């Protein structure tokens, strides 16, 4: 790929591949000169080393190195390890319709609802707002709806209050040790930039209010909404799955 400033960024594989071709070509050339067998054998050993480094580097001797002084990454290294396909990208992707912020108390809430900033909810629920705007005739096209939300007109906030009405959002705190580390709440639009978390839930998350943060996800499909409402809501999870005891104890 080209980067800014007329400078390129490349993968290591290219490098490795080139090696092979170069040496391979030389071999085909050398056999046409009927060269002494010592040279051809040396070239064949080098070709074997090149292919082995391409397939799995740093396993049949020393690892080839780049213009830096760290070893190249081969086909085998692109699959294994915690920083590899399986671990990092097949189980553990990054996600759209997600945000994060700092959590505060909000002791006035009911167990099934949370406080969500207006500025965050206007971003997570953007396609829903476009749909509402163009369905109610406030916007002639999707471009007009984009303009209206960008300017933050008055009707945008009413459409937002109408879109968030009964639509759960999943809150999650980073060390998800058990399944009560993800829970679904009903948003309540607030000012500011901090999420408000019901006190009685804090023990489930293991959360205090001295700098912790939470991630919020919004379920899209109808089935995801019904699963959030029926399986993951906070008013269904009041007993611990490790033992039958309540986990909504006042602290």
């Amino acid at each position: 790929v080209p980067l800014d400033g007329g400078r390129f960024a490349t993968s290591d594989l290219n490098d490795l591949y080139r090696r092979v071709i170069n040496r391979n070509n030389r071999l085909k050339r050398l056999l046409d000169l009927a060269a002494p067998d010592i040279i051809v054998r040396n070239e064949k050993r080098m070709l074997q080393e090149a292919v082995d480094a391409l397939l799995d580097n740093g396993r049949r001797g020393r690892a080839i190195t780049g213009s830096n002084k760290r070893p190249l990454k081969s086909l085998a290294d692109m699959i294994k390890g915690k920083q590899g396909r399986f671990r990092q990208n097949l189980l553990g992707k990054r996600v759209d319709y997600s945000g994060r912020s700092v959590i505060t108390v909000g002791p006035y809430l009911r167990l099934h609802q949370c406080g969500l900033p207006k500025k965050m909810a206007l971003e997570l629920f953007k396609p829903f707002i476009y749909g509402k705007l163009e369905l109610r005739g406030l916007a002639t096209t999707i471009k007009a709806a984009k303009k209206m939300v960008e300017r933050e007109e008055a009707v945008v906030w009413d459409i937002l209050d109408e879109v968030i009405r009964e639509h759960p959002v999943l809150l999650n705190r980073a060390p998800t040790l058990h399944r009560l580390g993800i829970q679904a709440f009903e948003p309540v639009l607030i000012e500011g930039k901090a999420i408000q978390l019901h006190p009685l839930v804090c023990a489930a998350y293991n959360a205090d209010f001295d700098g912790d943060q939470m991630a919020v996800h919004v379920p899209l499909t109808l089935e995801a909404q019904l699963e959030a409402r029926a399986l993951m809501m906070s008013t269904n999870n009041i007993l611990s799955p490790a033992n039958g005891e309540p986990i909504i104890v006042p602290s």
Binding site: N42, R45, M46, E49, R60, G61, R62
Partner: peptide, 10 residues
């Protein structure tokens, strides 16, 4: 040994 260069030298 494992170095191709070592074997070539030998």
């Amino acid at each position: 040994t494992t170095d191709p260069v070592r074997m070539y030298m030998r």
